Amino acid sequence: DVGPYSNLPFKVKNRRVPYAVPHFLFFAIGMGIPFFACYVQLKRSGSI
Amino acid sequence: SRKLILFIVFLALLLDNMLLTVVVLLFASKATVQLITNPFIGLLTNRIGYPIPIFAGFCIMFVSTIMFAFSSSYAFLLIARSLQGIGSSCSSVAGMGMLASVYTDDEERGNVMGIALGGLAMGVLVGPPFGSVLYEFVGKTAPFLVLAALVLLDGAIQLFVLQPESQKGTPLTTLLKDPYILIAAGSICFANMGIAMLEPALPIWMMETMCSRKWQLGVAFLPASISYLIGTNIFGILAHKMGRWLCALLGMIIVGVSILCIPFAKNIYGLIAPNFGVGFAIGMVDSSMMPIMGYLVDLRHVSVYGSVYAIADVAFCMGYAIGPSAGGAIAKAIGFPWLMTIIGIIDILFAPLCFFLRSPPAK
Amino acid sequence: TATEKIIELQKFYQSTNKPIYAAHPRSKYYLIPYFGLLGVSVAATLFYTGRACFGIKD
Amino acid sequence: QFKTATSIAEVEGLENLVGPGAKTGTVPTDLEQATGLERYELLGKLEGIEVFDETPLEAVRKGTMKDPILIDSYDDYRYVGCTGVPADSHNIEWLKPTTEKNARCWECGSVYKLNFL
Amino acid sequence: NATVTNLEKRWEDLPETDQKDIISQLSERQKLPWKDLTLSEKKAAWYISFGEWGPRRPVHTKEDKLYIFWGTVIGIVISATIFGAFRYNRNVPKTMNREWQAASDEYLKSKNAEPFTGYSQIQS
Amino acid sequence: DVPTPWGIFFQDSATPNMEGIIELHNNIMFYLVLILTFVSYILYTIIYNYSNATIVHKYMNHGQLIEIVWTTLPAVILLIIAFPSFILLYLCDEVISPAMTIKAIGLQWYWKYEYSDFINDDGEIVEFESYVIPEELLEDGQLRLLDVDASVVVPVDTHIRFIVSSADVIHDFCVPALGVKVDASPGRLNQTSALIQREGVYYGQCSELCGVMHSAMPIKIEAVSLYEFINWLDEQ
Amino acid sequence: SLTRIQGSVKRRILTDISVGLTLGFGFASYWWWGVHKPTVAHRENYYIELAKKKKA
Amino acid sequence: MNYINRWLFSTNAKDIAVLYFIFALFCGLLGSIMSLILRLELSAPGNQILMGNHQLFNVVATAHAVLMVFFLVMPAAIGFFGNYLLPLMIGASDMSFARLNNISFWLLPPALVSLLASALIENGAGTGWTVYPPLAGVQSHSGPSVDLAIFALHLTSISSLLGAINFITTTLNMRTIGMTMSKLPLFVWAVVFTSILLLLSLPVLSAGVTLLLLDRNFNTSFFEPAGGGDPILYQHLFWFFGHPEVYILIIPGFGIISHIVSTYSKKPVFGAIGMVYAMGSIGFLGLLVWSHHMYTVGLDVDSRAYFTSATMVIAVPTGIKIFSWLATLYGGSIRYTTPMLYAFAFLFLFTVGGLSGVVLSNASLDIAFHDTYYVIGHFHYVLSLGAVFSLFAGYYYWSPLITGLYYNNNLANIQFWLLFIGTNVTFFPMHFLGLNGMPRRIPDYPDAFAGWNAISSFGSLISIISVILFAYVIYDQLVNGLTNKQLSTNSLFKNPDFIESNIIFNDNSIKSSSIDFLLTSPPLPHTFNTPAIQS
Amino acid sequence: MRIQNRENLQLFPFHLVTNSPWPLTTSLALMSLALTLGLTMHGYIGNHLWLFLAISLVLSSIFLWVRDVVIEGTYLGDHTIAVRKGLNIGFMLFVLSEILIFAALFWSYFHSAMGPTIEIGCQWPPVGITSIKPTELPLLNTIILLASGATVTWAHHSILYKDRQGTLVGLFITTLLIILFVGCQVLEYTWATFTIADSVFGSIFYAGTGLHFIHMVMLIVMLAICYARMYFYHFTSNHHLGLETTILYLHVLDIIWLFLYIVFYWWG
Amino acid sequence: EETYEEFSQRYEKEFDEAYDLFEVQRVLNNCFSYDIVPSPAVIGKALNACRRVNDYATAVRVFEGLKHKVETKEQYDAYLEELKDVREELGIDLKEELFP
Numbered sequence A: 001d002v003g004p005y006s007n008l009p010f011k012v013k014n015r016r017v018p019y020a021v022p023h024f025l026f027f028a029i030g031m032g033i034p035f036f037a038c039y040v041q042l043k044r045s046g047s048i
Numbered sequence B: 001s002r003k004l005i006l007f008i009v010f011l012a013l014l015l016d017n018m019l020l021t022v023v024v025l026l027f028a029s030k031a032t033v034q035l036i037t038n039p040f041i042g043l044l045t046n047r048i049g050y051p052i053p054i055f056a057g058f059c060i061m062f063v064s065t066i067m068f069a070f071s072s073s074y075a076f077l078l079i080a081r082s083l084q085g086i087g088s089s090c091s092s093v094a095g096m097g098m099l100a101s102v103y104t105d106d107e108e109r110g111n112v113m114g115i116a117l118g119g120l121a122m123g124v125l126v127g128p129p130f131g132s133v134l135y136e137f138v139g140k141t142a143p144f145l146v147l148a149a150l151v152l153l154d155g156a157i158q159l160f161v162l163q164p165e166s167q168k169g170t171p172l173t174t175l176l177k178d179p180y181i182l183i184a185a186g187s188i189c190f191a192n193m194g195i196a197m198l199e200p201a202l203p204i205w206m207m208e209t210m211c212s213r214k215w216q217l218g219v220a221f222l223p224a225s226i227s228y229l230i231g232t233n234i235f236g237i238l239a240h241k242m243g244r245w246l247c248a249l250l251g252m253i254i255v256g257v258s259i260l261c262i263p264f265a266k267n268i269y270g271l272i273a274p275n276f277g278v279g280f281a282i283g284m285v286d287s288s289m290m291p292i293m294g295y296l297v298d299l300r301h302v303s304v305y306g307s308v309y310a311i312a313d314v315a316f317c318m319g320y321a322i323g324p325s326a327g328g329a330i331a332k333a334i335g336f337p338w339l340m341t342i343i344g345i346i347d348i349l350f351a352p353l354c355f356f357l358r359s360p361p362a363k
Numbered sequence C: 001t002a003t004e005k006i007i008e009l010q011k012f013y014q015s016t017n018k019p020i021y022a023a024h025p026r027s028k029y030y031l032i033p034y035f036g037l038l039g040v041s042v043a044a045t046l047f048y049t050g051r052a053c054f055g056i057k058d
Numbered sequence D: 001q002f003k004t005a006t007s008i009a010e011v012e013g014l015e016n017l018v019g020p021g022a023k024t025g026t027v028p029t030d031l032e033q034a035t036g037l038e039r040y041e042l043l044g045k046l047e048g049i050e051v052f053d054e055t056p057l058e059a060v061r062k063g064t065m066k067d068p069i070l071i072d073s074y075d076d077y078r079y080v081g082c083t084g085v086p087a088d089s090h091n092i093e094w095l096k097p098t099t100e101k102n103a104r105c106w107e108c109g110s111v112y113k114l115n116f117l
Numbered sequence E: 001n002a003t004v005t006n007l008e009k010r011w012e013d014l015p016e017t018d019q020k021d022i023i024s025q026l027s028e029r030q031k032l033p034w035k036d037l038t039l040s041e042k043k044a045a046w047y048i049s050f051g052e053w054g055p056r057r058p059v060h061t062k063e064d065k066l067y068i069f070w071g072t073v074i075g076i077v078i079s080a081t082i083f084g085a086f087r088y089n090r091n092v093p094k095t096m097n098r099e100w101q102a103a104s105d106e107y108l109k110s111k112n113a114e115p116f117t118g119y120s121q122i123q124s
Numbered sequence F: 001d002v003p004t005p006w007g008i009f010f011q012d013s014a015t016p017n018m019e020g021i022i023e024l025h026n027n028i029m030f031y032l033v034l035i036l037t038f039v040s041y042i043l044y045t046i047i048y049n050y051s052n053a054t055i056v057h058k059y060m061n062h063g064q065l066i067e068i069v070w071t072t073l074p075a076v077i078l079l080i081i082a083f084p085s086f087i088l089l090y091l092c093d094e095v096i097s098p099a100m101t102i103k104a105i106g107l108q109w110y111w112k113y114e115y116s117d118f119i120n121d122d123g124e125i126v127e128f129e130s131y132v133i134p135e136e137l138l139e140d141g142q143l144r145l146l147d148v149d150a151s152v153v154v155p156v157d158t159h160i161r162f163i164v165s166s167a168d169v170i171h172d173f174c175v176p177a178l179g180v181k182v183d184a185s186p187g188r189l190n191q192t193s194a195l196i197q198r199e200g201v202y203y204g205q206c207s208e209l210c211g212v213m214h215s216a217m218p219i220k221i222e223a224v225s226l227y228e229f230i231n232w233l234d235e236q
Numbered sequence G: 001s002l003t004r005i006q007g008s009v010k011r012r013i014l015t016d017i018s019v020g021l022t023l024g025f026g027f028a029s030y031w032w033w034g035v036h037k038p039t040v041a042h043r044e045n046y047y048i049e050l051a052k053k054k055k056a
Numbered sequence H: 001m002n003y004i005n006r007w008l009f010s011t012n013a014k015d016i017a018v019l020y021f022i023f024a025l026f027c028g029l030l031g032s033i034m035s036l037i038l039r040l041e042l043s044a045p046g047n048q049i050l051m052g053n054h055q056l057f058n059v060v061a062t063a064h065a066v067l068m069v070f071f072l073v074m075p076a077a078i079g080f081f082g083n084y085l086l087p088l089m090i091g092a093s094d095m096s097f098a099r100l101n102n103i104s105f106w107l108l109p110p111a112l113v114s115l116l117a118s119a120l121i122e123n124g125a126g127t128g129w130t131v132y133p134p135l136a137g138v139q140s141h142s143g144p145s146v147d148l149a150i151f152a153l154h155l156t157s158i159s160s161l162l163g164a165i166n167f168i169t170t171t172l173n174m175r176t177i178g179m180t181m182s183k184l185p186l187f188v189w190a191v192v193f194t195s196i197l198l199l200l201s202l203p204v205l206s207a208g209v210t211l212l213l214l215d216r217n218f219n220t221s222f223f224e225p226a227g228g229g230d231p232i233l234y235q236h237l238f239w240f241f242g243h244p245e246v247y248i249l250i251i252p253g254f255g256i257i258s259h260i261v262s263t264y265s266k267k268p269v270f271g272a273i274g275m276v277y278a279m280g281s282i283g284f285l286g287l288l289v290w291s292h293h294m295y296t297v298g299l300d301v302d303s304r305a306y307f308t309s310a311t312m313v314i315a316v317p318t319g320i321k322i323f324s325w326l327a328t329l330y331g332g333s334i335r336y337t338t339p340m341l342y343a344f345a346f347l348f349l350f351t352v353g354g355l356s357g358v359v360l361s362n363a364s365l366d367i368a369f370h371d372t373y374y375v376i377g378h379f380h381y382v383l384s385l386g387a388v389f390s391l392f393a394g395y396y397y398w399s400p401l402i403t404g405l406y407y408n409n410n411l412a413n414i415q416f417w418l419l420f421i422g423t424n425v426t427f428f429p430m431h432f433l434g435l436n437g438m439p440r441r442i443p444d445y446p447d448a449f450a451g452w453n454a455i456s457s458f459g460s461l462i463s464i465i466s467v468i469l470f471a472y473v474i475y476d477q478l479v480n481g482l483t484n485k486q487l488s489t490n491s492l493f494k495n496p497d498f499i500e501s502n503i504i505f506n507d508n509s510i511k512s513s514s515i516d517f518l519l520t521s522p523p524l525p526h527t528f529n530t531p532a533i534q535s
Numbered sequence I: 001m002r003i004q005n006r007e008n009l010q011l012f013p014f015h016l017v018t019n020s021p022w023p024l025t026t027s028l029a030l031m032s033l034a035l036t037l038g039l040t041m042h043g044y045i046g047n048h049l050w051l052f053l054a055i056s057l058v059l060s061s062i063f064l065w066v067r068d069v070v071i072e073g074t075y076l077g078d079h080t081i082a083v084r085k086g087l088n089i090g091f092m093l094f095v096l097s098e099i100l101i102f103a104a105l106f107w108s109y110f111h112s113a114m115g116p117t118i119e120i121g122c123q124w125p126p127v128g129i130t131s132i133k134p135t136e137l138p139l140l141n142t143i144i145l146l147a148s149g150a151t152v153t154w155a156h157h158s159i160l161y162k163d164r165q166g167t168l169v170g171l172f173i174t175t176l177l178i179i180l181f182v183g184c185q186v187l188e189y190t191w192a193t194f195t196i197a198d199s200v201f202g203s204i205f206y207a208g209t210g211l212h213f214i215h216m217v218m219l220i221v222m223l224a225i226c227y228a229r230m231y232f233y234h235f236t237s238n239h240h241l242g243l244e245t246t247i248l249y250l251h252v253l254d255i256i257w258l259f260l261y262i263v264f265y266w267w268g
Numbered sequence J: 001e002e003t004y005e006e007f008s009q010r011y012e013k014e015f016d017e018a019y020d021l022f023e024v025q026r027v028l029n030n031c032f033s034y035d036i037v038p039s040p041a042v043i044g045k046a047l048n049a050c051r052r053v054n055d056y057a058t059a060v061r062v063f064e065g066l067k068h069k070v071e072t073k074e075q076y077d078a079y080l081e082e083l084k085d086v087r088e089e090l091g092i093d094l095k096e097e098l099f100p
C-alpha cells in the first residue's frame, strides 16, 4: 500500500472527525501546558 | 623563561616526530648522524651558551623539511635526513639542558620534564605527515602553527618587553667514570631498543598471520601513543613520592612482561592491550630516569649539566640508529615470539640493577 | 535426542510462523510473569507522581 | 529442513543449508553447524565463488545508444554512479536506468541499459 | 495556419494529446531546408522549446510580491495591537514619574556623575 | 556610574583599568567591522549580478592561491589583536605598595564590610553591613534597586585592594565603572585592585545567581577627599 | 582582435576584492578617527582642568 | 496488530525519524511559550505577570534552556535528519543496530515526564541550566526537583551515546560498492564528527552530575568546603561537556547548508576536501578550550594567556568555510526558493553572532562582559539565528521528498520575513543593555534599562505569530498538498539550463549529486534490494 | 552475481532485524526506576519494595534482549563476516565510553591531591584517617587478577585446537578466581575505619573502587553465561564472538586495577 | 590549463561527432561554461551540428547566448559581421528579427 499518505502515524483523509480538530488540539495543548505549571505554582504560594 | 622553556621544549619535541613520520635506511642514517653530532653539541653548550644550539635546530629543521617537500632526488632526501638528525640533537640537547637550568628544585624538575617529554606522542598523533603532498594537509597544520606562534608571543612579551658565573667542570671522562651515571643511561637504551625492534618487524608478522590490512597496521600503534603521554604525566609526579629507583625497576618489569605478552595474541584485540602496557612502561622509565640524572650529577659533581644530557641523548638515539632493522634480521630465524621473549627476559634480568640508585652514594 | 538438538531447533526456528521470542513452548514462563509485573511497576509510579503533586506524603 | 547442499549449485533456497551434526565430545566445526546466509558464504568461499561481490562499475569506454553499457539487475531499475571514462574526471552524477528507458548522464554522455535477470 | 498561428495564448490549455500532434507535425516540417518555413512555424518552434511556459515559469510573479508584502504588514499589525493591549495595563512603580526623576538629577549633580557624555534620568 | 535610560555604550570610566579595556575593545572593533563590510559587500554583489544568470561556471572549483590568502590573513589579524591584549594582561596589576585593604564578605542577600587596618589593641575593627532600601521606604529621588543604607567610603588617589569571599553560596562582586568583577566562592579568598581618579558615586550589582533575592544586593562606593574620609572615620 | 575573448571572470574577481577592502577601511577608519579619538581627547582635557582647580 | 508492529515495535530507520520530528515540534512549542512567559515579565519595571514570586522565574528560564537545547535541536538534527538521510546518502539498507535506534527514541518521552514533574512537586528547580552545587544543594532547594532534573540529563545522555555508536558503526562498514571514505557527502562527515564529540564528551557530564546527586542525598562531601572540597571542580567537569555541546548543535547544520548552496546555485562546492578538513579542525580545537567560561573564578595569569590564544584560533576554519560558501555561490545561477532564503540569512547572521565571540575570548575584556546580556545576545544569534534557520531550511528542502506533498510558497515566504524581523528586533538591543551593565538571571531591573526592554518584548510577538503561521503551513501541506505543485515552479528541484529544451527537460528532470533525489516520492520501505554501484 | 538461482537469497550481507518489543519495555522500566528513586529518597513512598522491583525489571529486560541476540546468531544463522565486524566495532566503542568515566574520577582525585584545602590540615590522608596498607589483601587481588587474565588465554587456545575438556576447565577456573577477588574486596569494606562522609579522600576512594565492583560483577555474569553456552554446544572453532567480547573486557579491567593500585594505595 | 588553441580544437572535434539533439545541446551547454568565449569557427561547427539533427530553436538560441557571454556591444556586432554567410546560407533568423 505504498503511497503519499501511508508513512505517517496518523490518518489524514477519509476520516470521520476532520483533521483540523486533531491538528489544532496538538498545538493548543503544547502551547498551553507551560501556563498550567505557572498557575499551579502561583496558587500554591498564596499569590492568586 | 619557565613557561617559555616549557613551550620551547614542547614545540621542539613536537616538530621532530612531525617531520619524521611523513613519507613520500634513511631512518638509520638520520639516527646515526644524530648519535655522532651529540657530544660536540654537549661540549659547545659549555662555552657558547644554551640559546644558540636551540636557535640552530630550528633553521636546521626548516632546511631539512624544505628539502623533503621540494625535492624528489635521493641525494637531497639523504641530506634532509642527515640535517634532521644533526639538528634535532641541537634542539633536544640544548632544550633539556636549559630546562634543567631554570628549574632548580629537585621536585619541580620531574613534573616539568614529564610535561616536556609528553610532546613526543603529540608529534606523532598530530600529523602522520606534516606539510604533506596535498594543499589541504597544510589546511590542518596551519591552525596549530598559529597557536604555537601566538603562545611564543606570550613568552617573548614576558621576557623582553615587560617583567617576566659559569663553571668549567665535569669533564666527559669524569662523567663516564661514574657508574651510577651510567646505570640510567643503560636502561634508557634498553627501552628504546625495544620499541624500535618492534617497529619494523611487527607489521611484517601481522601480514603473515593476522590477515590484516594496512589500516590495522597503522592503527595498532595508537594505544602506545596515548599510553606514553598518560604514563609520563602521571609518573613525573608519582616518581618522587614512591622512589625513583622503584619506578624504574617496576617500569622495566612491565616492559618485559608486555613484550612477552605481545606474541601470544592472534587477534588485533589481543594486540591492543600489550601496546598500552608497553607505552606506560616506557613512559615510566623515561620520566623516572630523566630527572634523576641531574640530581645524581649535582650530588656527586659540580652543577654544569650539559654533557650529562648529551650522554642521555646518545642513549636515546643509539637504539633508533641500530636495532630496528636488526630486530627484523634476527626474525625469520629466531621467529616472531622468540625476539619478544628474549627482550622481555633481558628486561627482567636487567631490572634488579635499578636497586643501586635507591640511596645515592655519599659524595 | 542427544546433546545436539542444535540441528532440530534449527528446523523449528525457521518458518515457526510466530515471533522468535514466543515460538518455543517455554516462552510462556519468561513472559506471563514479566509483562504482568511491569504493569504493576508502571501503575505504582504514576500513583505517586500525582500523589506528590498534591502534597500527600506517606 | 530438507536435503543438505554440497556446493553452490544445489541450493534452491533456505531449505538446503542446514547440514549434519557434530559428534558428542568434540568442538563442532563451521561445516557441521551453519544455517542461513552464513553457510551460503562458507560454501561460496571454499570453491572460489564470491557470493557478495565488491567490484565497482566499468570505466573503460563511453556509451552510445547503439552500444550501451549493460548493467545487471534483479529489479526493474538500478542506481548507477558516473564519474567518467578515466574514472575520476567527471564529478559524481547519479542515474536510474530502468527497463523502459536508458540513463544518459547530462555531463559526459555515457548511456546505461538495464539487463533483467 | 490556424493550428500554429498564435500558440502563445492557447497552447497551455490544450491537453497532452493535442500537444504531441503539433510536436510531431513540426518534426517532419523542420527536416526540409529552412527558408521554406512560414514565419508562424518559426515562432512556434521557438516557443515550444524555449518559452515562458511549464518549467520556465518564474518562482514569483508580479502579483505574489504584493501578497507577501501585505501579509507581512498584516502580521506585524497584530503583534503591535497585542503588545499595546498588554502595555496599557501595567504596574507602574512610584519611581517612574517626571517629578521623581528630577530629584535624582539634583542628587546626581551635587556629586558630579558622568562628567563625560551625560547624566539624565528623565524618560517620563 | 549610574546607568542611563537609552544606553548604547560603556559607562564613564574612573580607573586606568577601565580605560585600557575601552581602548582594547575599540581596537578589536576595527578589524571586526572590516571583515563584516567585506562579507556584506560580496553578498550584495552576488545578489546584484548573479541572480537568474544564463551562464553557470561549473568548472571554477579548486583555486590554489586564494586558499593561501583566506588562510593567512586572519592569522595576521589574530596576532595583531593578541599583542595588545597580552600587554594589558601582564602589565596592569598591583605592582607596588598596596595602600588599603577592604574585606567584602558576601552573605546571602546583603554585604558585610570590614576595614582590615584601623584596629585598636582590643579588636575594634570598623565594620558594617550594607542592605538594600525597599521601594516602600525610598526617599525623594533615590534610585530604585540600587541604593543602599550604608555605603562604602574611600579616599581618592589611593590604591584599594578588595578581598572577596563568601559565606553561603557563590556570589559576584562587580562595579562596572571601576572595572572590578571578581567572584565570591564559599571556600577561597579572591582579590582585586582599583585606583579612583575622581570623586563621585559608583553603583554596581551582583552577577552570579544565588536564589530568590538575586536582583537586590546593590553595591555603592563613594570617593570622598582625604579630609572627609578622616571625618567619616572619626565618627564610625 | 574583437572576436577573441579569453579571461573576464578573473578581472571581475580582482575588481570585487579591490572594492570590498577599500570600503572596509573607509568604514573602519571612520570608527577610529571620528568616534574614538575625539572621546579620548575630551576625557583627557576634562582631567587636565580638575588638577588646575585643585592647584588653585 | 499491524499498527503496533510498525510504529511501536519498530526496526525501520526511516520510521523513527518521523516520530523524532513529531516529538521535537512539541518540545519546541513548550520552550517557545516559556520564552514568551519570561519576555512578558521583563517588559516594564516592577512585578507584572508573576506577581512577586522570583522563584517561578528561574524555573521558567531553566526549563526553557533544558527543553530547547536537549529536546528540540538535538532530536531534530540527529534524530530526524540523521536517521532518515544518512542511510539513503551512503547506500545502506538500514542502520546496523536497529533496536538501539528504537530505544534511543523511546528513552525521550520518559525523560520529558521527569522535567515536567520537576516543576510541579514543590517550589521547583531554579538552579540555572548549569546546576552549580552549593545553590543546588539541600539547604536552598529541598525537594525531589533538582533530583528529577538530574535524571532527565541521564536518559538523554544514554540516547545520544547509543545513537553516536550506531552512526559511527553504520558509516564504517555498511557502504555501497565503490564508495570509499573520501567520496562521502558532507552531511555524513558532519554526523560522524558530532558523534565522535558525543562519545568523548558525555561521560564527564555523567560523572559530574552523579557526583552532585550523591552529594545532595548521601552527604559525601565532594563539593563541600568543610570536608576538603572545592565547588570549582564541578565547573571543570561541566564545561568539558559544556563547550563541545555548542558545536554538536552547529556541525549538523553546516552540512545541510552546503547541499542547499550546491543545488540552487548550480555549482559544486568550492574545495569539498577543505570543508572536511575544516570540520575536523573545528571539532578537535573544541575540546582544548573549556575555561573561557570561567575567567572570574580566580585563575592564574599564565593560564589566561593560553585560553585567549586557543580560543581565537577557531576563527580560521570557520572563516575558510564561510569564504568557500561565498566562492561556491559566486559564479553560478541563483534562484530564490524558500530554502535558499534561509541559506542567505544564515551566512550573515552566523557571522555577526560569531564576531562577538572574538570580543569575549579575551581575558582582559571579559571583566566587563561576564554575566551580562552581551553574552545572551552573542549566543542567540548563533543558536536561534544559526541552528533554527538551518532546521527550517532542511524541513523546507526535504519535506516534499519524504511526504510526497508540496507546500504553499507565499505563506512560507511570509513566515520567513516575519521570523527574520522578529529575531532581529528581539536579540539586537541586548548588546546595548549588556554594554551598559545589565546582569543575567534577574526578574527586576533598575529604571534605566526600561526602554530597550520595551523593544525586545515586541519581537517575541512577531516570532510567535510566525510559529502559528508555520502550523498553518503544515496543515495546508498535509491537506491539498497534491494540487500545490502547480502554483509555483518552486516545486522543481532544478530548473532547465539555458540550451536545454523543455521537452528534453521533462524526460530527464532530476540531475543530482546524491542518491536522495533519485528515490521515489515516498522512498520505499525496502529501498535497496540490488546494491547501488559507483565508479 | 551470475550464480544460477541467486534471487532466492538475499543480495547483501546485512541483518534486517524483525520487530521486537524490548526497547519500549526497557524504556518504561527505566522511567519507573527513575521516578521511584527520585521520590523514595525524599519521602512520598515509605516502602522500599518498589525500587527493587524496578531494578529487577530492568535486568530482566536486558536478559530478554540477549535471548534474541543469541537465537538470531546460533539458530537462524544471520551473522556474516560483515555483521560480526560491526558487532566488534560497537563493543569497542562502548568500552571506550566506560573508560572515559574513570578518567573523570582520576582527575577528581588529582585536583584535590595537589592543592588541599585549608580546612583540612595540609597533608594527605589526614589525621584520624588510617589508610589501607598496600602490603595486605590489596596485593592478593593483583595476583589473582593477573592469574585470571593468564588463565582465559588457555581457554581461547583450547577452542582453536579443538579441545572440549580444556575450555570448560579454564572458564570455570577463571570464574572461581574472579569470585575470590570480589569476596576479598567485600570483606575489606568491613575492616576499614573511615567512611564515605568523613572527608574528600573517603568520598573519592570509594567512588573509584565502587565502580570497579559492579564492572566485575558483570564479568562474573558474562563468564557464567559463556560456560553455560559452551556446555550446550553453541560455539564453533572459528565462530565464537562471546569469548572475544568477554576477553577484551577482562584485560581492560585488569589494566584499570593496576592504576587504582598505584594512585589510590601507595601514593598519599 | 588548456590554451585557447586546444580548447578551440577539442570542441570542434566534439561537435563533429554529435548524433542526436540531446548530444548537441549537451556539448553546447558546457561550451558556454568556461572563461573563454567560443571562437567563430566553433560556433560555425555548432550550427552545422544543429542542421544535421534538424533543430531550429537551438540555432536561434546559440546567437542569444552570445549576447550574454560577450562583455560589450562592439564585440557582439563583430561576431554577427563574421557569421553572416552561415546565417544567410542555412536560413537562421535572429530573435530580434522574429519578436517571438
Ligand code: HEA
Residues within 6 Å of the ligand: F035, F039, F074, F077, F078, H246, H247, H249, H250, H292, H293, H294, H314, H315, H316, H318, H319, H320, H322, H350, H351, H354, H355, H356, H357, H358, H360, H361, H362, H366, H369, H370, H371, H375, H379, H382, H383
Ligand atoms: C551554538 C552556537 C555557538 C557557537 C557555534 C559557539 C562557538 C563560539 N563561541 Fe560559544 N557559546 C555559546 C554559543 C555558541 N558558541 C553559548 C550559548 C555559550 C554560553 C552561554 C552561557 O553560558 O550562558 C557560549 C560560550 C561562549 C563564550 C563564553 C562567554 C562568557 O564568558 O559567558 C564565548 C566567549 O567567551 C564564546 C565565544 C564563541 C566563539 C568565538 C565561537 C566561535 O566558534 C565562533 C567563530 C566564528 C567566527 C570567528 C566567524 C568567522 C567569520 C569570518 C569572516 C572569519 C574572519 C576571521 C576573523 C574574524 C579574524 N562562546
Ligand SMILES: NCCc1c[nH]c2ccc(O)cc12
Residues within 6 Å of the ligand: B017, B120, B121, B124, B192, B195, B224, B225, B228, B279, B282, B286
Ligand atoms: N622514548 C620514545 C618511546 C616512544 C613511545 N611511543 C613512541 C612513538 C613514536 C616514537 O617515535 C617513539 C615512541
Ligand code: CUA
Residues within 6 Å of the ligand: F108, F109, F171, F172, F206, F207, F208, F209, F210, F211, F213, F214, F217
Ligand atoms: Cu545573591 Cu547574588
Ligand SMILES: [Cu+2]
Residues within 6 Å of the ligand: H242, H243, H289, H290, H292, H293
Ligand atoms: Cu565555551
Ligand SMILES: [Zn+2]
Residues within 6 Å of the ligand: D082, D083, D084, D090, D093, D105, D107, D108, D109, D110
Ligand atoms: Zn558521466
